[PDB]
Amino acid sequence: CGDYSDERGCLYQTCQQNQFTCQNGRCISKTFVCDEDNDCGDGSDELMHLCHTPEPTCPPHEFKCDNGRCIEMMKLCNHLDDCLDNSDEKGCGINECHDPSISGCDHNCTDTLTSFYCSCRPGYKLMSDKRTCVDIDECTEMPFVCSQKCENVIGSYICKCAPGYLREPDGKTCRQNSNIEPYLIFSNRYYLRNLTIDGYFYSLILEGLDNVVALDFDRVEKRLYWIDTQRQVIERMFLNKTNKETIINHRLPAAESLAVDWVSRKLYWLDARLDGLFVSDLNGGHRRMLAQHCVDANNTFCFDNPRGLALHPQYGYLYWADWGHRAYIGRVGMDGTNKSVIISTKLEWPNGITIDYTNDLLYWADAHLGYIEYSDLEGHHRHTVYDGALPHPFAITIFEDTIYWTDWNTRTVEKGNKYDGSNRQTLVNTTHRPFDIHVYHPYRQPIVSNPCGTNNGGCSHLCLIKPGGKGFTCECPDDFRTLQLSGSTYCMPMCSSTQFLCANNEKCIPIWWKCDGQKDCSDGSDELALCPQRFCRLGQFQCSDGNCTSPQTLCNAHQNCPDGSDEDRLLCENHHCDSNEWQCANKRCIPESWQCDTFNDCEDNSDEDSSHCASRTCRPGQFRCANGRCIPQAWKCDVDNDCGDHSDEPIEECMSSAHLCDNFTEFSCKTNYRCIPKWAVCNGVDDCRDNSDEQGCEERTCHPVGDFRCKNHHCIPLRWQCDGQNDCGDNSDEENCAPRECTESEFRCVNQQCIPSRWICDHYNDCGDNSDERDCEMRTCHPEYFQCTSGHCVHSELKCDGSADCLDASDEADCPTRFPDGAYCQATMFECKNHVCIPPYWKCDGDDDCGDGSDEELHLCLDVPCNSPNRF
Amino acid sequence: EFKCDNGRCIEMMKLCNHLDDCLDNSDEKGCGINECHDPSISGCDHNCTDTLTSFYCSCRPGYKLMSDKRTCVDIDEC
Numbered sequence: 001c002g003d004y005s006d007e008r009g010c011l012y013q014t015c016q017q018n019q020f021t022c023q024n025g026r027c028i029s030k031t032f033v034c035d036e037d038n039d040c041g042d043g044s045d046e047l048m049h050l051c052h053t054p055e056p057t058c059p060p061h062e063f064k065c066d067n068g069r070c071i072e073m074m075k076l077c078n079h080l081d082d083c084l085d086n087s088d089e090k091g092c093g094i095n096e097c098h099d100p101s102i103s104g105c106d107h108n109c110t111d112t113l114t115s116f117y118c119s120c121r122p123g124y125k126l127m128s129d130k131r132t133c134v135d136i137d138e139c140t141e142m143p144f145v146c147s148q149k150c151e152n153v154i155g156s157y158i159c160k161c162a163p164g165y166l167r168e169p170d171g172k173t174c175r176q177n178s179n180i181e182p183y184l185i186f187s188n189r190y191y192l193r194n195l196t197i198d199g200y201f202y203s204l205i206l207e208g209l210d211n212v213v214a215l216d217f218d219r220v221e222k223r224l225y226w227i228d229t230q231r232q233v234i235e236r237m238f239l240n241k242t243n244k245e246t247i248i249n250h251r252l253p254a255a256e257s258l259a260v261d262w263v264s265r266k267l268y269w270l271d272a273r274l275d276g277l278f279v280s281d282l283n284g285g286h287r288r289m290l291a292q293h294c295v296d297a298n299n300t301f302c303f304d305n306p307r308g309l310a311l312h313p314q315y316g317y318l319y320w321a322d323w324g325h326r327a328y329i330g331r332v333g334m335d336g337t338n339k340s341v342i343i344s345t346k347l348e349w350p351n352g353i354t355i356d357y358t359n360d361l362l363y364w365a366d367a368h369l370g371y372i373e374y375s376d377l378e379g380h381h382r383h384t385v386y387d388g389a390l391p392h393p394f395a396i397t398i399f400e401d402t403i404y405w406t407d408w409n410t411r412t413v414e415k416g417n418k419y420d421g422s423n424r425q426t427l428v429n430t431t432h433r434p435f436d437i438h439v440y441h442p443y444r445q446p447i448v449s450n451p452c453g454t455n456n457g458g459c460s461h462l463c464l465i466k467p468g469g470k471g472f473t474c475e476c477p478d479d480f481r482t483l484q485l486s487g488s489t490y491c492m493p494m495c496s497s498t499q500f501l502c503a504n505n506e507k508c509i510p511i512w513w514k515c516d517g518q519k520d521c522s523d524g525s526d527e528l529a530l531c532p533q534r535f536c537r538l539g540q541f542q543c544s545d546g547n548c549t550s551p552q553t554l555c556n557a558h559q560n561c562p563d564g565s566d567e568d569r570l571l572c573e574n575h576h577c578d579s580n581e582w583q584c585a586n587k588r589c590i591p592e593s594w595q596c597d598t599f600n601d602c603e604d605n606s607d608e609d610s611s612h613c614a615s616r617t618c619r620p621g622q623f624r625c626a627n628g629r630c631i632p633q634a635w636k637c638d639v640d641n642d643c644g645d646h647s648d649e650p651i652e653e654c655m656s657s658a659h660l661c662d663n664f665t666e667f668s669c670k671t672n673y674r675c676i677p678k679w680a681v682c683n684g685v686d687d688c689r690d691n692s693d694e695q696g697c698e699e700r701t702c703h704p705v706g707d708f709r710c711k712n713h714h715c716i717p718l719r720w721q722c723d724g725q726n727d728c729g730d731n732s733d734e735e736n737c738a739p740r741e742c743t744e745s746e747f748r749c750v751n752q753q754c755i756p757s758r759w760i761c762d763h764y765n766d767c768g769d770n771s772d773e774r775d776c777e778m779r780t781c782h783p784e785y786f787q788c789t790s791g792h793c794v795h796s797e798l799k800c801d802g803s804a805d806c807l808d809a810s811d812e813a814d815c816p817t818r819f820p821d822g823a824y825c826q827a828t829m830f831e832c833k834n835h836v837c838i839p840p841y842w843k844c845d846g847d848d849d850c851g852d853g854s855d856e857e858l859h860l861c862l863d864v865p866c867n868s869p870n871r872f
Numbered sequence: 873e874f875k876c877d878n879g880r881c882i883e884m885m886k887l888c889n890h891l892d893d894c895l896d897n898s899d900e901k902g903c904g905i906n907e908c909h910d911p912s913i914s915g916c917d918h919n920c921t922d923t924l925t926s927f928y929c930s931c932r933p934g935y936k937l938m939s940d941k942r943t944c945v946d947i948d949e950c
């Protein structure tokens with residue numbers, strides 16, 4: 001039919017018809033036989049995939065004839081017409097090299113039974129002329145010849161060792177000279193571990209963390225920073241465990257990776273949700289988003305899922321990786337400039353990334369493809385440490401000549417040679433995923449001077465090293481406009497409302513942190529003496545009436561606070577939403593994806609303003625369709641009209657040669673023009689409509705290690721096996737599962753199931769057998785929890801919060817009035833005998849929520865005469 | 873690979889390559905040149921077949937080569 005049909009059935013190309021990647025039933029005669037007729041799928045003409053010329057291969061005991069035969073070496077020049085071209089006789093090479101007139105070669109001509117050939121001395125590459133030998137640049141061409149640095153020599157190479165590395169007498173090897181002995185540092189799900197390099201000693205640096213996926217040390221101060229994604233905090237601690245604190249706790253929707261700078265004394269971390277790389281001092285005083293949007297200057301590569309970081313202060317470049325649709329390993333200068341891509345080919349899931357400071361080689365690991373590669377810092381010559389046999393590596397660090405990587409599927413730490421991946425040794429296996437890894441050693445952070453030097457190089461807030469490891473650029477916090485003065489910079493204090501500005505202008509804290517019982521500003525202007533007593537708890541907005549409302553509800557186009565300052569004109573004037581939150585006319589904030597989502601999500605309905613959606617300028621990396629909705633570029637030219645209108649599917653271009661599935665990962669489905677990835681194949685889901693992904697799962701194989709095969713021919717990671725979840729529908733994963741051993745901070749139920757140690761007497765019977773909730777009076781409790789009189793544990797934060805989390809309500813009745821005025825309820829709420837601050841609307845509201853909050857207010861509302869009482 | 877008299881396995885390409893590839897130099901040792909073409913030596917019953925070193929013989933079908941490597945004796949196929 002026509003192009004307006006916008007639908008196609010199963011073509012089922014059989015003999016002559018051959019549906020290409022764009023599903024075009026072109027003739028079978030077009031297979032490179034002078035016929036590039038199918039420009040649509042482009043499969044009819046292939047530059048090298050269709051040009052093979054595979055004649056030359058034949059057994060070495062056979063001399064290939066010029067006619068194409070493979071006359072035997074014994075039959076070579078056997079005085080018999082063995083071939084049509086008679087290459088055996090026609091070709092009888094006699095002392096061609098001995099003849100000086102012909103076969104003149106550079107180093108060493110080697111004769112044969114037919115014609116001649118030549119060989120070059122070691123370190124000299126033979127030229128295409130087959131007579132000229134050219135010296136090999138072993139330092140760049142084959143960097144694995146030398147450990148650490150190298151110098152090119154004519155016909156050979158000289159290896160050296162960086163300072164601190166003692167060169168071994170054997171040569172081409174280096175050995176450390178530091179006083180300290182290096183030991184691996186990696187983070188489990190709840191534990192920071194301490195493992196020696198040889199794997200002889202195992203330890204536990206710190207436990208009791210929700211979910212740690214990243215860590216990085218600081219040689220200067222002997223600190224150890226990490227990220228708790230579940231808790232959304234960036235915390236640091238001394239190696240001796242003397243002090244622990246939360247550096248950053250605000251605006252961390254998801255922090256995949258972290259990299260501590262040990263030169264400019266800065267902290268960098270990637271944010272997957274906000275899609276940007278941030279910078280802050282080791283105390284988190286000043287924050288600034290350094291990079292955002294796309295990185296290729298063409299919008300092909302953009303921050304989608306950045307989960308790797310590696311600092312090289314010697315050149316001031318911070319390499320990072322992204323496992324989105326368009327995987328890239330691009331780098332940025334530490335000052336936030338020179339944003340550029342490095343490696344963008346043969347890459348699906350670059351989870352891990354590191355920089356070998358010894359020889360300046362950028363190492364990265366791919367999860368789906370399963371390889372580990374190293375290249376120059378400009379990403380020119382890619383060499384594979386491993387072919388891809390690794391099931392699913394996540395983190396990678398290099399020390400001396402050994403590369404240490406942590407693999408999720410095998411749930412273990414493995415090490416090998418940094419160049420050829422030899423001596424692959426499994427150090428220790430962990431019950432949980434191994435996550436980020438590092439090698440703690442003074443050499444891992446080489447000493448290099450700070451261009452800032454002092455006073456942040458005379459910068460007001462931030463001093464970031466310029467690219468190339470020379471000079472610095474002044475910066476400003478996120479809430480400051482960076483003006484470039486004459487030979488200097490000025491940070492405009494321009495800040496939105498609902499955000500206090502310190503008198504010293506050090507930072508722009510939120511308004512609800514002004515006079516919050518804490519001197520948030522270093523000056524302390526926020527906690528002015530002349531300020532009303534704030535009865536509301538920290539992290540809450542206090543209205544003039546004294547009621548407490550959530551800061552998220554501030555200026556939410558709804559008069560939540562009775563006093564009215566919630567929607568006050570001055571407080572909502574110049575209100576700015578989050579970076580990913582698209583502001584509406586009524587100042588209500590909605591996610592940027594909802595800007596023209598075709599849904600009246602915002603009360604003012606500005607999210608469906610035709611005028612603004614027609615004139616909607618969209619961030620790079622997302623495709624704009626007719627409706628004005630901006631789906632991601634990966635959602636453009638897909639079989640599914642994600643935008644709804646077929647404008648998101650330029651079927652002319654979608655069937656054209658522009659959209660061809662990547663050979664490495666993107667698997668083309670024959671019936672449509674879909675380009676689902678390789679790991680999307682046989683995922684048990686109809687990822688592409690024709691179900692071609694799920695057709696060959698019986699023929700499809702699994703990874704030899706770190707993969708479990710189910711009865712449905714489903715390959716799943718070995719870690720997912722016996723996880724208590726049916727990863728494969730046939731329950732083969734959970735068919736036979738001996739209970740696993742519980743870790744240090746895991747309590748073992750009588751059901752032989754491991755639960756977090758914090759959940760004993762959780763007051764929610766998390767374990768099925770309810771064995772966790774026993775002996776609570778004899779259990780004391782954890783240091784960070786308050787114990788109810790009944791004996792159960794509760795968060796110390798939830799104490800005296802107006803919420804009786806304890807059943808006996810002891811968590812609230814053991815504290816005085818929330819304010820010295822003489823009452824417990826700040827927002828005119830109802831306080832029962834248990835001192836629970838039942839909301840004023842919730843006062844005498846249907847069921848008796850409070851333990852002793854039974855109300856005789858039948859006059860206001862008799863219990864029997866209640867709508868809530870659906871069932872007598 | 874052509875097995876050397878010393879026990880090596882000098883390559884066929886290296887056979888008679890004018891190089892001392894083996895201790896016995898079997899490659900350069902008595903390079904087989906038209907030994908079958910010479911009627912004085914390599915006299916075989918049916919068909920002498922030359923090689924890069926010395927010679928050998930082949931018999932017509934139905935005739936088994938004798939231990940002498942020069943006499944072909946009819947096979948008793950029955």
Ligand SMILES: *[C@@H]1O[C@H](CO)[C@@H](O[C@@H]2O[C@H](CO)[C@@H](O[C@@H]3O[C@H](CO)[C@@H](O)[C@H](O)[C@@H]3O)[C@H](O)[C@H]2NC(C)=O)[C@H](O)[C@H]1NC(C)=O
Nearest residue numbers: 180181182183193194195196201203204205238239240241
């Ligand atoms: C992680 O584990 C490693 C290995 O246990 C720890 O490094 C070790 O630290 C101890 C205590 O400082 C060192 O003992 C020292 O021995 C020397 C003599 O060899 C002695 O002069 C010192 O006074 C001290 O007793 C041990 O040698 C050292 N080993 C290594 C591998 O360097 C590391 O401190 C642990 N880190 C954390 C944060 O848990």
Ligand SMILES: *[C@@H]1O[C@H](CO)[C@@H](O[C@@H]2O[C@H](CO)[C@@H](O[C@@H]3O[C@H](CO)[C@@H](O)[C@H](O)[C@@H]3O)[C@H](O)[C@H]2NC(C)=O)[C@H](O)[C@H]1NC(C)=O
Nearest residue numbers: 218219220221222223224237238239240241242243244282
């Ligand atoms: C655990 O290890 C860390 C890192 O080595 C220790 O932090 C640093 O410890 C040193 C020695 O106590 C501190 O030096 C002292 O500084 C004060 C001034 O702040 C000075 O008056 C003292 O004479 C001495 O020079 C250093 O300040 C401290 N870190 C920083 C940068 O503040 C930590 O103390 C160790 N904890 C223990 C006791 O295991």
Ligand SMILES: *[C@@H]1O[C@H](CO)[C@@H](O[C@@H]2O[C@H](CO)[C@@H](O[C@@H]3O[C@H](CO)[C@@H](O)[C@H](O)[C@@H]3O)[C@H](O)[C@H]2NC(C)=O)[C@H](O)[C@H]1NC(C)=O
Nearest residue numbers: 140331333337338339340341342376377378379380467468
């Ligand atoms: C900003 O980043 C870009 C991209 O990384 C830098 O450009 C790069 O500069 C290096 C050093 O000159 C180049 O390496 C050289 O490449 C050539 C082959 O092109 C090779 O023969 C040399 O031995 C060396 O490896 C690299 O190719 C080049 N890359 C690109 C894409 O331009 C730039 O220098 C950085 N500095 C700035 C301008 O901020």
Ligand SMILES: *[C@@H]1O[C@H](CO)[C@@H](O)[C@H](O)[C@H]1NC(C)=O
Nearest residue numbers: 106107108109110119120121
């Ligand atoms: C190459 O030729 C030189 C000069 O004749 C000689 O010294 C050297 O041993 C030869 N090497 C090889 C590989 O034959």
Ligand SMILES: *[C@@H]1O[C@H](CO)[C@@H](O)[C@H](O)[C@H]1NC(C)=O
Nearest residue numbers: 296297298299300301344658
């Ligand atoms: C990059 O940008 C150019 C225009 O400057 C465009 O023609 C091209 O298609 C874009 N994609 C590539 C090849 O990176």
Ligand SMILES: *[C@@H]1O[C@H](CO)[C@@H](O)[C@H](O)[C@H]1NC(C)=O
Nearest residue numbers: 412426427428429430431741
């Ligand atoms: C680690 O691997 C070894 C060798 O397969 C095995 O004996 C040991 O039980 C494993 N440990 C864990 C915790 O799975």
Ligand SMILES: *[C@@H]1O[C@H](CO)[C@@H](O)[C@H](O)[C@H]1NC(C)=O
Nearest residue numbers: 917918919920921930931932
């Ligand atoms: C063997 O020798 C006979 C007699 O000269 C000749 O007719 C025949 O063609 C030869 N066959 C071979 C395989 O040389």
